[PDB]
């Protein structure tokens, strides 16, 4: 069989040579060092390939591509539904409420190395089934179900081989592109939690490379995004690296930290380092600032003209504490002209489950079934927005697995829409 | 070791005899069987009992028990903080947004059996976490975080084995319930889809022993719920119950199925079968119409006068197309005062987060940061009502584990609420 | 927008299955719109599904037969492939008792959660992956393909025919190159060798392998369908609503409303020609190891379907040198293999290599201590000699690889694994 | 309901103040710190109770305790069937063969942190099954079927919350003993692998205090083991620690050279005997007197400190040491307080070299090489080996009775006209 044959090392270095695609990219490892990693059989990746050529062409081609989290495959296909063209995929809600230990957890990478992956396959499964949906419906509504993946590979659950094993994982799960942050990963924080610990400069770049490289092995042109933390981090593991030694104070810690100097310095001096080896350049920061964002991307590109920003539009800010209606409302086109061309609400899901089954039981402990028929009434008022769920056993597949069960037999006296109340009432 | 060493049957028998708790139960098997299947030490089921013993008190004390269905850990915690006092949770939500295959699916029992084991562990999980968060910052506000859990059992996934070891895996879980309905599994469908194949009575009544045994084995005392779908089922596997034969056509089809007459009649007739082996009974049916719930209630309880119900309030029902505002707000205080005193709505987490997300999207996609604005705006409005999730960093314990860092090391340079943005 | 994974035409398919001889002998009663309707706008490539199926195929039309052992871990199929074997088995039972995502020891009574024989598959195609990985860096060609097809445990579908073809799809989503399915209730699912088997009619398992099939379709890969008949032994069905059923029908009823039906070989011959058009391969369980009953039942179905390719189960449930003599056991695959058993497997034979040696090693260690262990070590030495590659356990798991892979990221690590390791000292 | 009620801190502390259990234990956080994390009720973990305290009772009753690594449940119910006490779950053999990614692994803390815990309840399940056909069967030849199992924590798979999360997960699925080592968990290695990276000596009473946390907020007695790997690793994160300095001699990431061997070994473990049940430290031979010098030093602070040891697939036996050597080599070490001893990788070697000899056997001889197999399960039966019947070793007979309990006239049972009842008996 040649099924899965591998490319020869003169193929991907002709691709690598000529592709605009990695017109800005270093890898620091020869075409022949990925031939020697892939074996006899080059398992395809279809939706990882396609999610990840998307996502490119979409960066290049809208004026800006923002998401929403997600954390349920039914939440990445209402975003769809809306009109959204990205899925966010945060680690932060992963720990939450949707990882493998079945615990609750702050975002200090508690959870299994192999969730977000998890929930990349979720995510994909979910947006499939509305795309097969949608196809026996005739509904043409939506002209890509299979919306480019962008998941949380957090600071790589250890050193360069975890990296390297859970950007393969995510690749396998069809994700489109993932983000790599330059915390230790022991003590690991959400990037508005405190205790933030940096490491040195050259192993964010080895994490960069890792990831590259498993999605180089994987033969997919997966989207690479590098996360600062240096903003808030007042630690740092070493001083080995002469980039970081600038902002080192001098004084360890009693557990062997380097306190370093914050702030928007050594994020500028960190997003230079990593851009010959990031698709995309975040940094968090402890205000939504159009000023300070201007700085960081006019400081970027002075160096990289062409190096696509992202940006966190966290829940974790008040947002009508620190800015007014107007300013709210240009926010995302301001940040897009300045160049965050990804542009994400990291907790949207958490909020909107956790607001949304809250208001409900309220009403429910207070008044009972008047409590439901309010959102049941909701439902049917946003059918003109496009909104199908209030039908819901087509929306989960129920008119899908009666077309499969009549093709194996059309006289089948067990299918499930004909005699249902939907079919009935609705 | 004498840790986890079994009861004698002597021991288990004295218990179901003097138990007010097994006043109107049957079980066709023995005390000394119980043993039999034990082995030499019995695991101990902490929030199984827990959930079990709670369940039945609350179901004898208020009026009635209401539920939403759940489908994840913190969907649970928002019922438990907005004062409700037992999770539902649906094999439907399993099947479209919840189960191991990782798949969206219709309620046709299509994913791997241990999907709503997993999803009670989660929702306990979740709980206790609520209840660890509580007890440090001494928020007393919820009495019982660990709300006892119902879940659905759905047909068993097969046989009367299949039906074992699904009921001991939610038992391992914590379950306090599970229910359990008279289709044939592989064939299974949501009380509210049509194409539903009846099983003979006496294979029910195998069902509803097999959970209680499973529980019996545990040690725990699980409340167990029969479901009939008799209302709208038209299909039987066979006619060789005598029970079931006064509604078989003669009829069969190309799959062998007996046509059989449904509605009520047929369930009123299950239901009785199923009395002395359901803690509670439950009949699907087509229409939220307190009439008909009335009917079944009154025609049960004339020969079992303490046989407790439960009552579906589906989102498969067009509330307001069958039912004035009037009827909607008495609906549930009425069904009560029938004897269904286990009352849930099964899709209320899948409707809540499809229709959250859509909206919350539909306005992301015009307006960007202003639609979030808005929700956010409508989080810290509801702190008056006792929402906490918008300080989503303690919401998850993060303060909960920075107490775990300090007790382990007082001096730690890495905690994480200390320079929070939810802190500043 | 992308191009990737853009479904085929009808007209295309229809081509195929019109002028590929893969479904030359292949009934589906289904249309090439039907597939296409059900496959959305991308269709996922399934590379080792598509390889495996490829190979496997090829391979019972070139070797003199295909031979299989049971494998329950990834490191089992790996010693599988190194000793020369090529195509792994992967049984239900062995999922069963010791490998299935409950965590339970189960008998084989389809009580496992129904994603667990796909997960083995993934598991073993990984196991097989870093063995082939391993190969290439350390120039090792020794083995032609590591990447043997695998046959999977489908038992009874764990339900209805969406059921059955769930499990299908999720068998290919991991690399299966070929699956089983039986004629039994899956209510009341046995091993062939256990007793209270219950069958069901002629008609629902045509119904089981034609959705079996149109999941491979939607899939767009062309996975070997294997129908298995359990009708040897078993003296129960659903129904005797199927004509072709109605022979056997006793006429009297169980209390469950099962019928009883006059088992034997009989049976087995009608449900294996009615089963033939939708089967790349008929299995029938028997009691004993028989080549008469085997030359029986291969004539019978090859009278009517002369190129119907056959399968056996060499089962560990019987007792050998109870039936047979060692020159009849010497010969009895080359025989089987004569009269067009073309897949011949061993089920259970990775439970009984485990628990055995399993066993023999920790009586002895019990006994003995270190002299019990060090007696296995020195085996292993000395089957370097057949190829056996473990003792050297660090590089056996990718230890080597890993290696590679650190020192692409970075030439200079100063942590890489098998530089100053006990292994390159010791061994 | 008053199920799961939590005790007192003053119930707490009495029990630390008088179990004999907590003679030698140190804890630097206090009663009330575990009664703050317990929320309103305690689930009980009957098997990690029972398990942890069968396995301290046999350290203290038996000459030692052996084991061998178990990867499957199959595995732990022969090693219990064979004679043993204790089952060991590797954390190499997790990677190789038996973690939650589905992917083989070299032993760098590569699989997903919940993998160990998952073949602890396993292996609990097997055990539990092997125990419920027993009492059916009426088969009384094994005392305890629930053998305590000694669990892989590795370096904590990240910090101390790490740590604490992964002791909790091993004791829901009912661990009775785990260790825990001083690598660096992003370095993390075999201890007979090359590029180990120690931390801070107090990083690992961290881990050590974290380990025993998790127990006392469980309410179980759980036995913590210490590793060192100071015998063979050069390199270590941080000078920080005056106990480390000694041994300081930097690379390009930031690791400090330091001097391996014996001594910092020893150094270490007098550091962690307070917060320590059992000490192990990785060695690069099978050599006697490393043992006795390590395990007299110890014991002169330490007299009552109990000590384990790797008895590794990764050293080559017989090219170090002669037969009479290995013959005594146990009973030797348990004489200078080893009461812990296993070979980490045996399921490994046993489940690989099985295969490999009846595939070999297969691919040349077809049903003759499979037929001798089972002629040598029929040969041990002698021996006390049941699984010749496989039907009932995993349960056939015991869900018969569920199903004969549920329904006596059931026409479906599995046993009764079963090959295995025609032809095995
Ligand atoms: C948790 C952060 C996001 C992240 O670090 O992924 C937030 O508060 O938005
Ligand atoms: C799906 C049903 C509930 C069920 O059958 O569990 C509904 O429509 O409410
Ligand atoms: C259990 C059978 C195999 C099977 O039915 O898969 C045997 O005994 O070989
Ligand atoms: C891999 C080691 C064991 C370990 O470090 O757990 C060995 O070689 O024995
Ligand atoms: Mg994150
Ligand atoms: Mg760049
Ligand atoms: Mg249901
Ligand atoms: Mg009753
Ligand atoms: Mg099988
Ligand atoms: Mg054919
Ligand atoms: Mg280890
Ligand atoms: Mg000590």
Redesign the interface.
């Known amino acids: 069989?040649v099924?899965?044959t591998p490319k020869s090392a003169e193929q991907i270095q002709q691709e690598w040579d000529t592709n605009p695609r990695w017109k800005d990219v270093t890898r620091t490892?020869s075409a022949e060092?990925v031939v020697?990693?892939?074996?006899?059989?080059?398992?395809?990746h279809?939706?990882a390939?396609?999610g990840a050529?998307?996502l490119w062409?979409q960066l290049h081609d809208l004026e800006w591509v923002?998401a929403?989290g997600?954390?349920?495959?039914?939440?990445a296909?209402?975003?769809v539904?809306?009109?959204?063209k990205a899925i966010y995929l945060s680690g932060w809600q992963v720990?939450?409420?949707?990882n493998?230990?079945?615990?609750?957890?702050?975002?200090?990478?508690?959870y299994?190395?192999?969730?977000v992956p998890?929930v990349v396959?979720?995510i994909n499964?979910?947006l499939?089934?509305?795309?097969?949906i949608?196809?026996?419906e005739g509904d043409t509504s939506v002209?890509?179900?299979?919306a480019p993946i962008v998941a949380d590979g957090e600071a790589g659950?250890?050193?360069?081989?975890?990296v390297?094993?859970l950007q393969k994982?995510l690749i396998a799960a069809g994700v489109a592109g993932s983000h790599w942050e330059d915390q230790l990963?022991?003590?690991?924080?959400?990037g508005?939690?405190?205790?933030?610990?940096l490491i040195?400069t050259?192993?964010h770049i080895?994490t960069l490379?890792?990831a590259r490289?498993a999605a180089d092995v994987a033969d997919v042109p997966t989207v690479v995004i590098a996360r600062t933390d240096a903003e808030?981090a007042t630690?740092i593991?070493?001083?080995?690296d002469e980039r970081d030694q600038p902002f080192i104070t001098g004084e360890?810690?009693?557990?062997?930290?380097y306190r370093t100097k914050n702030g928007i310095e050594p994020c500028i001096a960190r997003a230079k380092a990593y851009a010959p080896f990031a698709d995309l350049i975040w940094m968090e920061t402890?205000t939504p600032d159009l000023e300070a964002a201007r700085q960081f991307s006019e400081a970027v590109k002075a160096e990289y003209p062409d190096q696509m920003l992202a940006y966190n539009?966290?829940?974790?800010?008040?947002?009508?504490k620190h800015l007014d209606?107007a300013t709210?409302?240009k926010?995302?086109?301001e940040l897009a002209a300045m160049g965050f061309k990804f542009?994400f609400?990291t907790?949207?899901?958490?909020?909107?489950?956790?607001?949304?089954?809250?208001?409900?039981?309220?009403g429910?402990?207070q008044?009972?079934?008047?409590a439901?028929?309010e959102?049941?009434?909701?439902?049917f008022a946003?059918e003109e927005?496009?909104?199908t769920?209030?039908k819901?056993?087509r929306?989960?597949?129920?008119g899908?697995?009666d077309?499969?069960?009549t093709?194996?037999?059309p006289?089948?006296?067990?299918?499930?829409?004909?005699?249902?109340?939907?079919?009935?009432?609705?």
């Open positions: 069989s099924v899965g490892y060092d020697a990693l892939q074996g006899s059989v080059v398992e395809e279809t939706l390939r396609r050529e998307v062409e923002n929403l997600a954390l349920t495959g039914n939440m296909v209402q975003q539904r809306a009109g959204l720990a939450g409420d949707a493998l230990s079945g615990h609750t957890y702050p975002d200090q990478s508690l299994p190395a192999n969730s998890q396959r979720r499964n979910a499939q089934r509305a795309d097969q949608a196809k026996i002209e890509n179900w299979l659950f250890g050193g360069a081989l975890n390297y094993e994982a990963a022991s003590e690991k924080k959400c508005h939690l405190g205790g933030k610990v040195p050259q192993q080895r490379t890792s490289l808030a630690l593991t070493s001083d080995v360890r810690t009693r557990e062997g930290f402890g539009c966290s829940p974790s800010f008040n947002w009508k209606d709210i409302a926010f995302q086109k542009q609400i907790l949207a899901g958490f909020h909107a489950l956790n607001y949304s089954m809250f208001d409900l039981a309220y429910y402990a008044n009972q079934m008047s439901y028929v959102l049941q009434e909701r439902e946003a927005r496009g909104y769920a209030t819901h056993q929306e989960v597949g129920a899908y697995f077309r499969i069960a093709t194996v037999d006289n089948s006296s067990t299918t499930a829409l004909t005699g249902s109340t939907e079919e009935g009432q609705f």
